């Protein structure tokens, strides 16, 4: 009967993970942040797509504004709505409406406009849309360790990259011999990370694979 003491002590460790993973859900179930990184990544592509002409279009201020049809597009995604926060907070509720129309117009423009890049209808959006949550979680994960690893002395994990690397690596089922929690605590939450990152990162590659069958 002594084992119940030793065996139940394990249950505790096995228990935390139940939350670390449960919490990971409450961080990817937001129809928002998910749908916001997507519309911010598609534009970063334009941030180097159209705003990357030689040092002769990068000097003519007149020509960037000249394309008043792109300026609104190459602005943010939600960093327009982000502002809406510092507005509604200042009771400028009147101005809120106008900015709401701007996001409405922007989603119709980009949404439909982008969908004009033929050869894939409704097949290419389900992708990124999904790629979102998938990545978000990994982030959350890397952040998890980040907190419990950055401060540690001799801990191979330092920058958000190094902690981010470990995330992808352990979530892509890859894992090397460079990124690994020093404090058993990191190793702990890690069990959760991968328990999550994997399952998700897999649903990702699942469609990546299928789609790849073209």
């Amino acid at each position, epitope marked *: 009967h002594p084992l119940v003491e030793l065996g139940v002590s394990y249950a505790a460790l096995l228990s935390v993970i139940v939350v670390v993973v449960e919490y990971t859900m409450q961080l990817s179930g937001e129809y928002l942040v998910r749908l916001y990184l997507v519309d911010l990544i598609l534009v970063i592509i334009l941030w180097a797509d159209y705003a990357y002409r030689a040092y002769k279009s990068g000097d003519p201020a007149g020509y960037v504004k000249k394309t008043l049809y792109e300026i609104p597009a190459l602005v943010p995604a939600g960093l327009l709505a982000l502002i809406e*926060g510092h507005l*509604a*907070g200042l*009771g*400028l*509720f*009147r101005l*809120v*409406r106008l900015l709401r129309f701007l996001r409405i117009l922007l989603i119709i423009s980009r949404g439909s406009k982008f969908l004009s890049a033929i050869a894939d209808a409704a097949d290419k959006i389900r992708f990124y849309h999904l790629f979102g949550a998938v990545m978000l979680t990994v982030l959350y994960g890397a952040f998890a360790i980040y907190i419990v690893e950055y401060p540690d002395p001799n801990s191979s994990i330092k920058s958000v990259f190094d902690a981010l690397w470990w995330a992808v690596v352990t979530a892509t089922t890859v894992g090397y011999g460079d990124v690994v929690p020093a404090t058993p605590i990191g190793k702990v939450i890690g069990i959760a990370v991968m328990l999550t990152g994997i399952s998700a990162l897999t649903l990702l590659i699942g469609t990546v694979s299928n789609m790849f069958q073209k």
Partner: antibody
Framework: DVQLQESGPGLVKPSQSLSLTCTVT?????????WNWIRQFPGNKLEWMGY???????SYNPSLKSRISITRDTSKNQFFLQLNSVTTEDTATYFC???????????WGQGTSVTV | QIVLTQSPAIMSASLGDRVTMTCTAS???????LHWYQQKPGSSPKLWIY???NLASGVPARFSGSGSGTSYSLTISSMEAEDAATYYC????????FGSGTKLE
């Protein structure tokens, strides 16, 4: 033609949480403006507790925060006031109001008396 | 955060006289976020003067508001049997607050 319709208990024992319910008609809690919970003490004074808004986000009175929170019934069109550990000081009247432009409750509910 | 002082806390006068009130904020404000509410004891509060210089829909033109920086007023021109109400003035700088109420008798 809008109109807030407040209702609620009105008597509880200390350390017990207060749960208020205010309905809204002729409008929506998601369109625009903010939604407040400003009480009126026995001293006829007025103390603003907090607010949820058209979007959802909320903010409270810097003092009460440590002991309160608020929500809403997105579907039925109502918001909820929640105060934890109601002492004697909390004895007062309660009101829910439409926070119009630059913050200015432009529509007040009739009222409810809460005793502690 | 800041505090409000609605003097007189209580005051009188009668039909005809240009009634006056004053909201003295311990600290500066913002001509916008300054509003006046009228409350008839027993009933429910009712916004009366918004954004310093413009009034509510169901308000008689007899009213007028004057303020800036640290002080604002709710001046009138003539009272009635109705005006007998507790007028409040709230502001919004750091957070939200209200006043003692320039009670009318």
């Amino acid at each position: 033609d809008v109109q807030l319709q407040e209702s609620g208990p009105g008597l509880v024992k200390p350390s017990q949480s207060l749960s208020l319910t205010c309905t809204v008609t002729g409008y929506s809690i998601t369109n625009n403006y903010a939604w407040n919970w400003i009480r009126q003490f026995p001293g006829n004074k007025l103390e603003w507790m907090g607010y949820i808004n058209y979007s959802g986000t909320t903010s409270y009175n810097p003092s009460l925060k440590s002991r309160i929170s608020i929500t809403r019934d997105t579907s039925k069109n109502q918001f909820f006031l929640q105060l934890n550990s109601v002492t004697t000081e909390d004895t007062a009247t309660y009101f829910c109001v439409r926070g119009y432009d630059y913050f200015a409750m432009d529509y007040w509910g009739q009222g409810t008396s809460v005793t502690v | 955060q800041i505090v409000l002082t609605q003097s007189p806390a209580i005051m009188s006068a009668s039909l005809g006289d240009r009634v006056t009130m004053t909201c003295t904020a311990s600290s500066s404000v913002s001509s916008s976020y300054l509003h006046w509410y009228q409350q008839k004891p027993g009933s429910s509060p009712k916004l009366w003067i918004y954004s310093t210089s413009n009034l509510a829909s169901g308000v008689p033109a007899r009213f007028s508001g004057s303020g800036s920086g640290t002080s604002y007023s709710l001046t009138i021109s003539s009272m009635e049997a109705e005006d007998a109400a507790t007028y409040y003035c709230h502001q919004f700088h750091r957070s939200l607050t209200f006043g003692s109420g320039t009670k009318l008798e």
